[PDB]
Amino acid sequence: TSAVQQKLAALEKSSGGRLGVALIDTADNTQVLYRGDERFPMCSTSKVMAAAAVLKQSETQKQLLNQPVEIKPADLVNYNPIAEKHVNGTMTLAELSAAALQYSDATAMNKLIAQLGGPGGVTAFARAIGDETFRLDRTEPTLNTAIPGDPRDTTTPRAMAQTLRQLTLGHALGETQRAQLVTWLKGNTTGAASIRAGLPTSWTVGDKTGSGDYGTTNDIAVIWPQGRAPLVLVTYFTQPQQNAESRRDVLASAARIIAEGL
């Protein structure tokens, strides 16, 4: 095993949970995995797939991103920092995608899932871009529940890193849509303590964090270092106790191991 794999095992051993990591280095297309084929609960990170799936709808539905969507009182769920300002008003699908990605607005995610025809529509998009692993089964606020061994709303680090790469660096989206997804991810407001905390400040990062119960603490990132080609990094972490505390710091450590070791 590599020095990196030994460091990630040591990190998990000290962490009080189960760690999954996938790194793709687009310089030479090498991949480094830790528990890369085990399922982990996604929580907020599934917002990337929903926003992307709406971006893909917009490739053929002109002006879709600018369509107003009513925010109704029944839509409010567990964390609504943007949508709670718009009840009985409207937000466009672009505003909903920005709110879900950059603030982790759960109401906004439920509107995106509904725009796709439910959780099966988000999963259908994953299958259409070659992700056979991702599954979304539920909606907010139940997506924040991360019961050990439950395969609902899970993916694997390997699959999530491949999909994230195809969405941001590859050809899964149209050029305008890919750029918009990357812009949204670079403007995330919730990631300062997670992968970003383990990276040199000069590197450009787009990411989506997530957290839920079982102390589930996640982050998926695309990283443009200086001096080398971009990287894609996924870090999932979940713990055995239902009310375990979030460990953004473990994700920062995994990011540091990768940034220093590859």
DSSP the chain: --HHHHHHHHHHHHHTSEEEEEEEETTTTEEEEESTTS-EE-GGGGHHHHHHHHHHHHTTSTTGGG-EEE--GGG--S--TTGGG-TTSEEEHHHHHHHHHHH--HHHHHHHHHHTTSHHHHHHHHHHTT-SS------TTGGG---TT--TTEE-HHHHHHHHHHHHTSSSS-HHHHHHHHHHHHT-SS-TTTGGGGS-TTSEEEEEEEEETTTEEEEEEEEE-SSS--EEEEEEEE-SSTTPPP-HHHHHHHHHHHHHH-
Angle separating helix axes 47-58 and 93-103, nearest 10 degrees: 160
Residues involved in catalysis:
44
- Contact between 64 and 54 (Cβ < 8 Å): yes
Instruction: Classify residue 173 as left (phi > 0), alpha (psi -120 to 50) or beta.
Output: beta
How far is it, in rounded angstroms, from Cα 114 to Cα 97?
A: 13
Cβ atoms of residues 257 and 233 within 8 Å: no
* Contact indicator for 55, 181 with CB cutoff of 8 Å: yes
| Residue carrying the six token digits 């699908």 | 93
- With beta carbons less than 8 A apart as the criterion, state whether 107 and 85 touch: no
Closest CA to 20 of 1, 35, 2, 39: 35
Q: Find out whether 140 is annotated in a ligand binding site.
A: yes
Which amino acid is it at 76? L
| Residue 17 to residue 1: CA distance in whole angstroms | 21
Domains, the chain, ordered by start: 3-260 (3.40.710.10)
Alpha-carbon span 237 to 163, nearest angstrom: 19
Residue 31 contacts residue 161 (beta carbons within 8 Å): yes
CA distances in angstroms from 134 to 19, 55, 92, 120, listed in the order given:
18, 18, 26, 11
The token duo for 145 is 């529940």
Strand partners, 220: 208, 234
**Beta partners for 222?**
206, 232
On the 0-12 / 13-18 / 19+ scale of CB atoms within 10 A, 221 is buried
Alpha-carbon Rg for the chain, nearest whole angstrom, is 17
**Which residues, at least 6 apart from 138, have a Cβ–Cβ distance to it below 8 Å?**
119, 152, 153
Close Cβ partners of 67 (under 8 Å, ≥ 6 residues apart): 92, 93
Q: Enter the resolution in angstroms.
A: 1.5
Residue 224 phi, psi (nearest 5): -110, 90
Cα 206 from Cα 192, distance rounded (Å): 11
For the residues of 186-214, what is the DSSP string, one character each? HT-SS-TTTGGGGS-TTSEEEEEEEEETT
Q: Which two tokens stand for residue 32?
A: 């480094």
Q: Give which of 87, 90, 141, 78 is closest to 113, Cα–Cα.
A: 141
Q: 55: Cβ–Cβ under 8 A, 6 or more apart, which residues?
A: 65, 97, 173, 174, 177, 180, 181
